[PDB]
Design a protein around this ligand. Structure first.
Ligand SMILES: C[C@H](CCC(=O)O)[C@H]1CC[C@H]2[C@@H]3[C@H](O)C[C@@H]4C[C@H](O)CC[C@]4(C)[C@H]3C[C@H](O)[C@]12C
Ligand SMILES: C[C@H](CCC(=O)O)[C@H]1CC[C@H]2[C@@H]3[C@H](O)C[C@@H]4C[C@H](O)CC[C@]4(C)[C@H]3C[C@H](O)[C@]12C
Ligand SMILES: Nc1ncnc2c1ncn2[C@@H]1O[C@H](COP(=O)(O)O)[C@@H](OP(=O)(O)O)[C@H]1O
Length: 274
């Protein structure tokens, strides 16, 4: 079995259960002062996690060097993390990968802050292809064009990227959530991190801001991270981290097919972010 089907959504086989998903959706309370990072896989989740954690530490890498992403911002749906986050007081820093139909319903009646990271779905496809083939054995790997077809038909972890992205950015103009793109993070870096500083209320000044940028660059973040693969292919999430790698993978035919499927599965989607 490639996936575990929970609420009509394909999940990874390990780390997730239906009962937990249901509980998280129906009973986990999102408290007004909470702040949650919500992404789709291979959109730059580790990058944004590190962005936020370096903003909070004002550039001091020590925390992100000593810890992994799930220790800093525990994923709500991940494992039995909900027990921990329920049995914890104060303002909580959490993360998530679910589409809105599975996000905790309580959040829709609160001023909890949510940062939604989006990426060009083609680069998302490419990053996922490389990462999921990254450490499988040659015979058991997935050829490019069948992974491409599976992505276009929603046979991907946490369901269709189109449904996920559409449902999440349909709430964009709410005050308590803001969307931002991996491309924005890659080229309009300083403006973007200052905007998320505004949104999170975290005050940060000169020097510390230069520190954050330097520490969030791909190269030295990669050196940091290679310093632990119990639940991730630790060696393999830092691939090359540019924008537009899909042009090196998509044939013209595949690009036209992708644009077509994008235009009926996400007709109500403007690409101003990319
Ligand atoms: C196991 C699964 C697929 C890996 C595979 O193809 O074998 C991978 C793909 C997306 C991953 C998740 C994403 O990387 C986001 C989270 C990052 C944290 O560092 C670990 C938990 C975290 C929630 C990851 C858990 C697990 O490693 C995931 C769920
Ligand atoms: C994530 C963890 C929560 C464990 C707990 O108390 O339940 C706690 C333990 C120590 C915390 C850190 C320490 O409190 C020191 C830092 C100062 C501020 O509290 C926020 C960032 C700061 C870097 C914290 C980040 C995070 O909240 C930490 C790392
Ligand atoms: N500091 C960083 N700066 C720029 N891009 C980064 C980055 N860290 C990771 N990326 C890229 O974000 C992708 C993985 O995202 P996620 O955390 O959701 O798995 C990868 O894309 P690529 O495979 O295209 O290189 C990764 O290289």
């Amino acid at each position: 079995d490639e996936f575990l089907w929970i609420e009509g959504i394909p999940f990874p086989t390990v780390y997730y259960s239906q009962e937990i998903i249901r509980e998280v959706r129906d009973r986990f309370v999102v408290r007004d002062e909470d702040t949650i990072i919500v992404t789709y896989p291979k959109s730059g989740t580790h990058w944004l996690n590190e962005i936020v954690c370096l903003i909070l530490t004002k550039g001091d890498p020590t925390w992100v060097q000593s810890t992994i992403a799930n220790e800093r911002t525990p994923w709500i749906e991940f494992e039995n993390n909900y027990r921990i986050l329920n049995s914890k007081e104060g303002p909580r820093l959490m993360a998530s990968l679910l589409p809105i139909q599975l996000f905790p319903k309580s959040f829709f009646s609160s001023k909890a802050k949510v940062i939604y990271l989006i990426r060009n779905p083609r680069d998302v496809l490419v990053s996922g292809y490389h990462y999921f083939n990254a450490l499988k054995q040659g015979k058991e790997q997935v050829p490019w064009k069948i992974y491409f077809e599976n992505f276009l038909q929603g046979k991907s972890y946490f369901g269709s990227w189109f449904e996920h992205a559409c449902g999440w950015i349909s709430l964009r103009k709410r005050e308590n959530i803001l969307v931002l793109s991996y491309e924005q993070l890659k080229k309009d870096t300083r403006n973007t991190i200052k905007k998320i500083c505004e949104f999170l209320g975290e005050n940060l000044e000169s020097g510390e801001l230069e520190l954050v940028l330097k520490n969030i660059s791909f190269q030295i973040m990669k050196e940091r991270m290679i310093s632990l693969s119990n639940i991730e292919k630790h060696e393999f999430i830092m691939r090359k981290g540019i924008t537009g790698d899909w042009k090196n993978h998509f044939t013209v035919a595949q690009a036209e097919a992708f644009d077509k499927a994008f235009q009926e599965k996400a007709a109500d989607f403007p690409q101003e972010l990319f």
